[PDB]
Short mmCIF file of N, CA, C and O in Angstrom, two decimals:
data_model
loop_
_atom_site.label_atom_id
_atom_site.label_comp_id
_atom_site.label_asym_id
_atom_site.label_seq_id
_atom_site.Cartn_x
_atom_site.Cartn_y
_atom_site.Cartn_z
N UNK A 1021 -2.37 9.89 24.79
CA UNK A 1021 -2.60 9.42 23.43
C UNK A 1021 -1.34 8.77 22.85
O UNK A 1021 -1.18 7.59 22.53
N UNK A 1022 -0.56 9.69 22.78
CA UNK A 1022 1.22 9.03 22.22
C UNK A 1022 2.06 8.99 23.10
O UNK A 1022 1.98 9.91 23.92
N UNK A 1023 2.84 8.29 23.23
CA UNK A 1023 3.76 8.18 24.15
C UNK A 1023 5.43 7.82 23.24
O UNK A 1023 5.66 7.20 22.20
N UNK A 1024 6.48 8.65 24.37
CA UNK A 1024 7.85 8.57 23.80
C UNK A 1024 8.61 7.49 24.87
O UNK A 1024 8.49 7.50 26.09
N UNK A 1025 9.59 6.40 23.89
CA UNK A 1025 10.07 5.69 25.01
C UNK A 1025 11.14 6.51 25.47
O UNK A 1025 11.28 7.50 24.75
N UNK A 1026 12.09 6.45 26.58
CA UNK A 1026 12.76 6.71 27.41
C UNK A 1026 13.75 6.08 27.20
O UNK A 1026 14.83 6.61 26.94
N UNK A 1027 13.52 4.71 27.29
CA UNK A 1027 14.94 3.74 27.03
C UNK A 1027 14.58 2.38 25.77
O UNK A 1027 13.60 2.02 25.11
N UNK A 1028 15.83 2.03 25.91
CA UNK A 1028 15.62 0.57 24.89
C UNK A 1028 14.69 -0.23 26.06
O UNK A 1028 14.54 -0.04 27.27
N UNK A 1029 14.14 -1.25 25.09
CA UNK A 1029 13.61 -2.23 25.90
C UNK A 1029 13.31 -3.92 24.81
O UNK A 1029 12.56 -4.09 23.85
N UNK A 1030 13.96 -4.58 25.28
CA UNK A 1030 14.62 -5.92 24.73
C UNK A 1030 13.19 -6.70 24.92
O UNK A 1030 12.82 -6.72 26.10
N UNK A 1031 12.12 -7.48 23.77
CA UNK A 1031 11.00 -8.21 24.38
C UNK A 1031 11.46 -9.57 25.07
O UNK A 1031 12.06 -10.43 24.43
N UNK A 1032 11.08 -9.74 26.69
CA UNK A 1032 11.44 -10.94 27.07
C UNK A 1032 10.13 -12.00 26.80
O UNK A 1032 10.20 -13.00 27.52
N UNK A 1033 9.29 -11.98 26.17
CA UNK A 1033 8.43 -13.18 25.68
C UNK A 1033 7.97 -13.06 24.11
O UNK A 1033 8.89 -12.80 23.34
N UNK A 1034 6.68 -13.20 23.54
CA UNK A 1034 6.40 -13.73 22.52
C UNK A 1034 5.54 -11.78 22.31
O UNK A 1034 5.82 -10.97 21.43
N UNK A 1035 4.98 -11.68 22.95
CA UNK A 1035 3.87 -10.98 23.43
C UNK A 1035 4.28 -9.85 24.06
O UNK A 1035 3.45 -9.04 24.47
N UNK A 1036 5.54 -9.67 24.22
CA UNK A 1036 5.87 -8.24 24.38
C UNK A 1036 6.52 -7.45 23.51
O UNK A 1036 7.26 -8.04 22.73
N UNK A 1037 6.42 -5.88 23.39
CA UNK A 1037 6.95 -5.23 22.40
C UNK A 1037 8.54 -5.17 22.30
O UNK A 1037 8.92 -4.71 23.37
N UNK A 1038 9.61 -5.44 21.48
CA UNK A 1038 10.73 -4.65 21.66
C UNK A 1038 10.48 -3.07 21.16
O UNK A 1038 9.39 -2.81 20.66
N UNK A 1039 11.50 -2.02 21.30
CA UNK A 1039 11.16 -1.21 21.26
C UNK A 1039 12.87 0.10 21.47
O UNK A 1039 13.26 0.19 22.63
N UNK A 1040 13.51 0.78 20.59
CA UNK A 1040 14.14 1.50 21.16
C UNK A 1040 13.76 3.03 21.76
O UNK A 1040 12.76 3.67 21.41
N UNK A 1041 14.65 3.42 22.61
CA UNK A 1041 14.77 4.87 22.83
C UNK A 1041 14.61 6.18 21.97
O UNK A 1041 15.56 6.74 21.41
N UNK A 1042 13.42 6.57 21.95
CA UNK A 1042 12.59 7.88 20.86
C UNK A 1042 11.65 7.18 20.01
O UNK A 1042 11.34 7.68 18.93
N UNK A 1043 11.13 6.01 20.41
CA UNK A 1043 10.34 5.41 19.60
C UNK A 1043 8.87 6.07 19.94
O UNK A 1043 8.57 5.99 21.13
N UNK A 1044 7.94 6.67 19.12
CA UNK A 1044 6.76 6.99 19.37
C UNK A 1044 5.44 6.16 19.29
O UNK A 1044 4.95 6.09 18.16
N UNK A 1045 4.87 5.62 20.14
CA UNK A 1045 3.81 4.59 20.55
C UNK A 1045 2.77 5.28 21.13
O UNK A 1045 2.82 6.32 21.79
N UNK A 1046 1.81 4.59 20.82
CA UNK A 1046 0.31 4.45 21.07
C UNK A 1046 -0.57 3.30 21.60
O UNK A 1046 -0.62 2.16 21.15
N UNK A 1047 -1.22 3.80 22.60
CA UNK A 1047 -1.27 2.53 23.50
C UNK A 1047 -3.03 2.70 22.95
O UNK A 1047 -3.77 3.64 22.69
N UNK A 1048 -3.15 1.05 22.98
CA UNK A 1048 -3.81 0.31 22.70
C UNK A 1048 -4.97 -0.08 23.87
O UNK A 1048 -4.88 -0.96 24.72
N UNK A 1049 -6.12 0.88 23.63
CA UNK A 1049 -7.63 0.76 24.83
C UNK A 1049 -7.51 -0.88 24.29
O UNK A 1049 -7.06 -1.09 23.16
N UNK A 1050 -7.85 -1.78 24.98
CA UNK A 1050 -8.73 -3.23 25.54
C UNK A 1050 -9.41 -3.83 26.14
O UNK A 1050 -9.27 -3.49 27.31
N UNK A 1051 -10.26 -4.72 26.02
CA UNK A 1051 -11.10 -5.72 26.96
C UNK A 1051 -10.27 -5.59 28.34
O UNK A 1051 -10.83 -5.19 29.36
N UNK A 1052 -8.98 -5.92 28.32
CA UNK A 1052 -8.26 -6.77 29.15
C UNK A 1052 -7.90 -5.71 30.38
O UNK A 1052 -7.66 -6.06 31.54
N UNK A 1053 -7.90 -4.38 29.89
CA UNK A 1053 -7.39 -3.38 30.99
C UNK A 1053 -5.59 -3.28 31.00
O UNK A 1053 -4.92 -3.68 30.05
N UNK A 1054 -5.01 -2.66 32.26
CA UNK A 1054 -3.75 -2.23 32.12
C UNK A 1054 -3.17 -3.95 32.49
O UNK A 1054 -4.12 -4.70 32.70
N UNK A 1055 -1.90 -4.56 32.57
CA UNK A 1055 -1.76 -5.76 33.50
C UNK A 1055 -0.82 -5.40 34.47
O UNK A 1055 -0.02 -4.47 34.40
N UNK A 1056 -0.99 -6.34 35.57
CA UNK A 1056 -0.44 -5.77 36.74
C UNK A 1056 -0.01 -7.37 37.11
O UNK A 1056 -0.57 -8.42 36.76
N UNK A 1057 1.24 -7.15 37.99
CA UNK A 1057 1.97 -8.25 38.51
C UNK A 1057 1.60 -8.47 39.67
O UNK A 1057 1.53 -7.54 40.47
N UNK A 1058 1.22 -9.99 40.08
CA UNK A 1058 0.02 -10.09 41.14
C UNK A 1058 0.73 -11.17 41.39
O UNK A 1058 1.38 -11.75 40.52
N UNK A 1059 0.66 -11.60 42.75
CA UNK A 1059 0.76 -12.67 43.77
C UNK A 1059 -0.58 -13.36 43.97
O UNK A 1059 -1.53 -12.58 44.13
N UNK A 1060 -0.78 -14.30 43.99
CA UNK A 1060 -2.21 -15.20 44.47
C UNK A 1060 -1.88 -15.40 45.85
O UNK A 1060 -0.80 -15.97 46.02
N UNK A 1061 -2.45 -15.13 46.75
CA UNK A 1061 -2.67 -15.39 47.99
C UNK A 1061 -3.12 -16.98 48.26
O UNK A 1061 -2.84 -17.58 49.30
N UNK A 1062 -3.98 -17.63 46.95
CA UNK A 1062 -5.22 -18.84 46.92
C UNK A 1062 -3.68 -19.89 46.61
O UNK A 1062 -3.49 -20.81 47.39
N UNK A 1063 -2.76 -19.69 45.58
CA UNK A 1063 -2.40 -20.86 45.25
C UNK A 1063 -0.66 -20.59 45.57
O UNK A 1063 0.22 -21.42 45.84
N UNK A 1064 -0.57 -19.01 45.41
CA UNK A 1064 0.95 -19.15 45.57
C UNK A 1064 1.84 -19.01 44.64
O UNK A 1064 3.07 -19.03 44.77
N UNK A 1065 0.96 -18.79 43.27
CA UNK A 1065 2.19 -18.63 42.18
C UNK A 1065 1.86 -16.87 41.84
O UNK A 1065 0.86 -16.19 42.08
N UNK A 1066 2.99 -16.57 41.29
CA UNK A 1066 3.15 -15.24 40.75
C UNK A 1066 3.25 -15.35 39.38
O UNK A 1066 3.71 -16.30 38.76
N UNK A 1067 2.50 -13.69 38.68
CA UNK A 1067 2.67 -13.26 37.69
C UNK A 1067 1.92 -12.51 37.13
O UNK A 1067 0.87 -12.59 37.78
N UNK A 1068 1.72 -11.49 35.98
CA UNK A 1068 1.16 -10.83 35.34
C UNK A 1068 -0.16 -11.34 35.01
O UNK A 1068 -0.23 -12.50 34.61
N UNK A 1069 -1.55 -10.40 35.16
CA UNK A 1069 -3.10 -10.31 35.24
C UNK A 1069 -3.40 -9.25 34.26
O UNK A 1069 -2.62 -8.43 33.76
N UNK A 1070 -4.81 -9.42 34.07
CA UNK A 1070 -5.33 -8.43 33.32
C UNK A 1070 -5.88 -7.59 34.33
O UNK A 1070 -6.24 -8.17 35.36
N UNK A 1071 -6.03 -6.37 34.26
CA UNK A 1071 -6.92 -5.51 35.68
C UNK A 1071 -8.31 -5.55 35.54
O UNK A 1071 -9.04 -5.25 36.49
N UNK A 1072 -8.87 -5.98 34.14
CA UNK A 1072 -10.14 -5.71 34.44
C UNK A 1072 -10.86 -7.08 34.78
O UNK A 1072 -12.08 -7.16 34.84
N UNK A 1073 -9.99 -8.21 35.01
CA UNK A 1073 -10.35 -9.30 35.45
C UNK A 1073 -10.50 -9.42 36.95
O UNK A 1073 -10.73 -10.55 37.36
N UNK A 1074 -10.42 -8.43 37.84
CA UNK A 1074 -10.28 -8.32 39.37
C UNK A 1074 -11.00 -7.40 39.94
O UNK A 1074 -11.45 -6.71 39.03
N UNK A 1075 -11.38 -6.98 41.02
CA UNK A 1075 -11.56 -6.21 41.68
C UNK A 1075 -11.17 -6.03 43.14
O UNK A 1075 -11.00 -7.00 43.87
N UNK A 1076 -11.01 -4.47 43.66
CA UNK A 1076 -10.50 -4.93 45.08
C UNK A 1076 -11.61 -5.78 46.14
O UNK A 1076 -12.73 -6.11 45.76
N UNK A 1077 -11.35 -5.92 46.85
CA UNK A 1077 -11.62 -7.05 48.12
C UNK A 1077 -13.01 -6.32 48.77
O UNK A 1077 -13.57 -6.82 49.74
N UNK B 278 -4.80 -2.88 47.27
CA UNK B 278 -4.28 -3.76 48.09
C UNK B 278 -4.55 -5.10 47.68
O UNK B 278 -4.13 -5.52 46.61
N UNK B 279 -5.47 -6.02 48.74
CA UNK B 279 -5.65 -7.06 48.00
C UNK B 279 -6.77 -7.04 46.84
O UNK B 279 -7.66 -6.19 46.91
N UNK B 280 -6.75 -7.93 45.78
CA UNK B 280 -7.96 -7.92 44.95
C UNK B 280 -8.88 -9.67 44.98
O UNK B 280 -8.65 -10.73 45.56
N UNK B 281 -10.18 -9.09 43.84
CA UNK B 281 -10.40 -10.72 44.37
C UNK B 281 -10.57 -10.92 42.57
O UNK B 281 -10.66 -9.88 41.91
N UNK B 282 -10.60 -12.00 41.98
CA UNK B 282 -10.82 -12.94 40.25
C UNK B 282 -11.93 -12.79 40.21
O UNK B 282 -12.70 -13.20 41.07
N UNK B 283 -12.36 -11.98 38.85
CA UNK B 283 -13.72 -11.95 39.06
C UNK B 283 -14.44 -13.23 38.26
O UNK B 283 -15.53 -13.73 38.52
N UNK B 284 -13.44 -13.65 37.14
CA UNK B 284 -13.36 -14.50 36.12
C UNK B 284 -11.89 -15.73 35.89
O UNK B 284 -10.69 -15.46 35.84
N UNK B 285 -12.35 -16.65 35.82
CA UNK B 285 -11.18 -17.66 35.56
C UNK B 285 -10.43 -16.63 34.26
O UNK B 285 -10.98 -15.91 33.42
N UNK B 286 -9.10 -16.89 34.48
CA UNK B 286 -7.84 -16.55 33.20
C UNK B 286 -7.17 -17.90 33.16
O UNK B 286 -6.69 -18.60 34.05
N UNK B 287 -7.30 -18.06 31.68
CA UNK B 287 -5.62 -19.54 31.80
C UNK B 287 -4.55 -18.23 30.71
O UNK B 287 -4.84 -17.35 29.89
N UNK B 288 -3.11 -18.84 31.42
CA UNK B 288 -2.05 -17.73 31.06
C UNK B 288 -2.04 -18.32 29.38
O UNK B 288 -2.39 -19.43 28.99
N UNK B 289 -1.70 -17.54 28.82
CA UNK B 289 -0.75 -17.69 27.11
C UNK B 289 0.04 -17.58 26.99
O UNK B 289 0.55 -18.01 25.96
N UNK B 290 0.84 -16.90 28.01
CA UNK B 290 2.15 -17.14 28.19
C UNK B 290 3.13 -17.77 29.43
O UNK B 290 2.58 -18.28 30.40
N UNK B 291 4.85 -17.69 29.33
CA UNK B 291 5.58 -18.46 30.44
C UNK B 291 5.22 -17.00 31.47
O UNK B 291 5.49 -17.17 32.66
N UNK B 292 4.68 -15.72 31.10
CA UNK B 292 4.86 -14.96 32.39
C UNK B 292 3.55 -14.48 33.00
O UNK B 292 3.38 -14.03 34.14
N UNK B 293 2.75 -14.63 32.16
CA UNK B 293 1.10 -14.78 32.80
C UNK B 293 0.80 -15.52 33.87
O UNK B 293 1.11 -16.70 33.77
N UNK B 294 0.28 -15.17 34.87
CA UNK B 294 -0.82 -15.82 35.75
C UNK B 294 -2.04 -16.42 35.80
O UNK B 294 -3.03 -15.70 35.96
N UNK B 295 -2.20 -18.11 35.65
CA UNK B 295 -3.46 -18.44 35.48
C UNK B 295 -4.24 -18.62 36.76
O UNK B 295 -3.64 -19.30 37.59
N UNK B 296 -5.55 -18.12 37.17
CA UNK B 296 -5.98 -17.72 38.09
C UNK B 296 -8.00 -17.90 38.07
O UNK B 296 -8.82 -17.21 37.47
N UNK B 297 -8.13 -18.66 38.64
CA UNK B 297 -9.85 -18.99 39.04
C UNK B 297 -10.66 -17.85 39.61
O UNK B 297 -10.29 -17.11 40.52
N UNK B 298 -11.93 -17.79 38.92
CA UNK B 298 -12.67 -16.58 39.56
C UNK B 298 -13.06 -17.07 41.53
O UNK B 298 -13.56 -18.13 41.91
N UNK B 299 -12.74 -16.21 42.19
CA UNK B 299 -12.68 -16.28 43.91
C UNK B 299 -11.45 -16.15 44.40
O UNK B 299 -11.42 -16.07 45.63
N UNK B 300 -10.14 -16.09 43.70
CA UNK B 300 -9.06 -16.26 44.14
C UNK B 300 -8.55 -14.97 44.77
O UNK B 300 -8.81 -13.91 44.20
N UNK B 301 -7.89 -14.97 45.83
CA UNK B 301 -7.42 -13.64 46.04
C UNK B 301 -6.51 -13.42 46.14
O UNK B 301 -5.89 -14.26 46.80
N UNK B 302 -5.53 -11.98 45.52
CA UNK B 302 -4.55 -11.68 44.50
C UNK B 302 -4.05 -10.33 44.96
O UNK B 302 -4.83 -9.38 44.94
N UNK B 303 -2.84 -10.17 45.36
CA UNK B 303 -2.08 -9.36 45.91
C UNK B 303 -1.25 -8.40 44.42
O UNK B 303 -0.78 -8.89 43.39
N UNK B 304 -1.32 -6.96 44.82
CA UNK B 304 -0.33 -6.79 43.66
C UNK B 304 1.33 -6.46 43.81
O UNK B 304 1.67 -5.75 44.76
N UNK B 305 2.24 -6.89 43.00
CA UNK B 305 3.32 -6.49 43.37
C UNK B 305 3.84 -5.17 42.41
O UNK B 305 3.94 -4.95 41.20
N UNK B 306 4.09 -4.43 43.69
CA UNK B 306 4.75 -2.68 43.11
C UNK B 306 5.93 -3.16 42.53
O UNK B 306 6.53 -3.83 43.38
N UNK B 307 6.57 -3.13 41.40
CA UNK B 307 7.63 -2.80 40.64
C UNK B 307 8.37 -1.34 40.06
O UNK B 307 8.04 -0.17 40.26
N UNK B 308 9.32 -1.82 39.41
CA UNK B 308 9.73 -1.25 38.91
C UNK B 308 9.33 -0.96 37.38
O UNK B 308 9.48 0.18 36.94
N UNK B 309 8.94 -1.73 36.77
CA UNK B 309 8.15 -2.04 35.32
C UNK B 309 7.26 -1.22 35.15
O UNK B 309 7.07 -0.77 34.02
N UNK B 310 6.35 -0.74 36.39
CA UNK B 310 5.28 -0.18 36.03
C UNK B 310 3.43 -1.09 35.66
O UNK B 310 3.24 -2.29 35.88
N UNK B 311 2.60 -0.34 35.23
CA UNK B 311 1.76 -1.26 34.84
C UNK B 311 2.11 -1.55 33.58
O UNK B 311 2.86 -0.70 33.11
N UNK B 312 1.84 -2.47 32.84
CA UNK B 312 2.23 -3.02 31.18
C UNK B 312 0.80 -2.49 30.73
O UNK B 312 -0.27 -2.51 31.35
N UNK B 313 1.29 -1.73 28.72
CA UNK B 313 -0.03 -1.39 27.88
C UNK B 313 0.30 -2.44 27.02
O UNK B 313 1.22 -3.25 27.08
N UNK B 314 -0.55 -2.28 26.26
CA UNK B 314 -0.44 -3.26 24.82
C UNK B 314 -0.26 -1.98 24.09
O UNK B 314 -1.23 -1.24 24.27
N UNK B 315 0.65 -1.47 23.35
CA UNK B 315 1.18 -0.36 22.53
C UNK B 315 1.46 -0.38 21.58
O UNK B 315 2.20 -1.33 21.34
N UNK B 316 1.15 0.53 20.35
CA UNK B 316 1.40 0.10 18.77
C UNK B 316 2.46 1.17 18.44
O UNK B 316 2.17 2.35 18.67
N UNK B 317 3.98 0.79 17.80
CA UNK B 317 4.52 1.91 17.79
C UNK B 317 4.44 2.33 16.40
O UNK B 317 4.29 1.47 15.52
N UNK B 318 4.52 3.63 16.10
CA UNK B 318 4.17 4.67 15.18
C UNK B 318 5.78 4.15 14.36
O UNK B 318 5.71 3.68 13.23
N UNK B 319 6.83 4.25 14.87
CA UNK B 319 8.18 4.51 14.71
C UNK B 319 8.27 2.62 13.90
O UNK B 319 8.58 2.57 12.71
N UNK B 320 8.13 1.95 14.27
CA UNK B 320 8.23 0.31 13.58
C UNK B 320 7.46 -0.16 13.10
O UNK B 320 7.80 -0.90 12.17
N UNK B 321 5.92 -0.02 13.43
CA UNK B 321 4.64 -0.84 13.32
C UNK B 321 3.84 -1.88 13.46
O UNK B 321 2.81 -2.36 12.98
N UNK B 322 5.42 -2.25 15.06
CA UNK B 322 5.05 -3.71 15.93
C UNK B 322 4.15 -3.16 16.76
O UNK B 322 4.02 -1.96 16.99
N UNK B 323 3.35 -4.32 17.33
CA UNK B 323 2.73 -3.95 18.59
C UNK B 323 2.68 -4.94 19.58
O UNK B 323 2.85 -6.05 19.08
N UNK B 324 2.51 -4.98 20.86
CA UNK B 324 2.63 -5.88 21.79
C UNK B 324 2.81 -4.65 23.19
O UNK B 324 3.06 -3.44 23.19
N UNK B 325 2.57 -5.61 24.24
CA UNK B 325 2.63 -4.91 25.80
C UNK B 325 4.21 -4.14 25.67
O UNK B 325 5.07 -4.46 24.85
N UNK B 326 4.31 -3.04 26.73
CA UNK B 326 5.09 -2.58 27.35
C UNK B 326 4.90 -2.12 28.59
O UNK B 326 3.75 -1.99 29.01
N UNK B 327 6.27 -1.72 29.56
CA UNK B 327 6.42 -1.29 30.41
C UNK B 327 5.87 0.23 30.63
O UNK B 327 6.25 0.99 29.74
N UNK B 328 5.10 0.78 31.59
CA UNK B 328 4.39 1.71 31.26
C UNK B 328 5.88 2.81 31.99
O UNK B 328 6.44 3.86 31.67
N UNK B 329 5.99 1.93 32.97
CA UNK B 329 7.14 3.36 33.07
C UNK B 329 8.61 3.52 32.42
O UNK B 329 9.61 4.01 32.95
N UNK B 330 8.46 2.95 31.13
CA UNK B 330 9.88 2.92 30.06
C UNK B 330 9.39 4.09 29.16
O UNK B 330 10.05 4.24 28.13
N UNK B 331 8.03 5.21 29.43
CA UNK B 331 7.57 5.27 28.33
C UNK B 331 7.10 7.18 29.26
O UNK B 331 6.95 7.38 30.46
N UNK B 332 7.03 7.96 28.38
CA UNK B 332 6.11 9.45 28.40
C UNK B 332 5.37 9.62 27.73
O UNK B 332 5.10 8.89 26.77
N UNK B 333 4.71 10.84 28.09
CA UNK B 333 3.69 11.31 27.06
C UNK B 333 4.37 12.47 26.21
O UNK B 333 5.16 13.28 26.69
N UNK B 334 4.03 12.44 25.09
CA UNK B 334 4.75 12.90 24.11
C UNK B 334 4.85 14.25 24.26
O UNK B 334 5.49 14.91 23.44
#
């Protein structure tokens, strides 16, 4: 349900949280699922997915 | 292991993956963890984080 951060964490885009160390957060159920950093096998580029956009093979 | 698109994604961001439904998509284990979309209690920003920067309270 709540979660404590551990460390600082600096946002590197638009769309990510900054956030320091003892900060108390709550994560957010979505459409989109957890995201996971994925390789395309099809084209070759890398980067972050939604999980509930996939399934395994 | 591998996964397959079940649905076209175009990215919104520089670190998203845009990706066609059929494509098949490898995941890469990090260090980051999976990313939530998280609302913190402590600021009242919200946006993704690193799931393993983070505990349960």
């Amino acid at each position: 349900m709540t979660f404590v951060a551990l460390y600082d964490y600096e946002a590197r885009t638009e769309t990510d949280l900054s956030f320091k160390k003892g900060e108390r957060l709550q994560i957010v159920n979505n459409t989109e699922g957890d995201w996971w950093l994925a390789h395309s096998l099809t084209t070759g580029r890398t980067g972050y997915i939604p999980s509930n956009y996939v399934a395994p093979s």
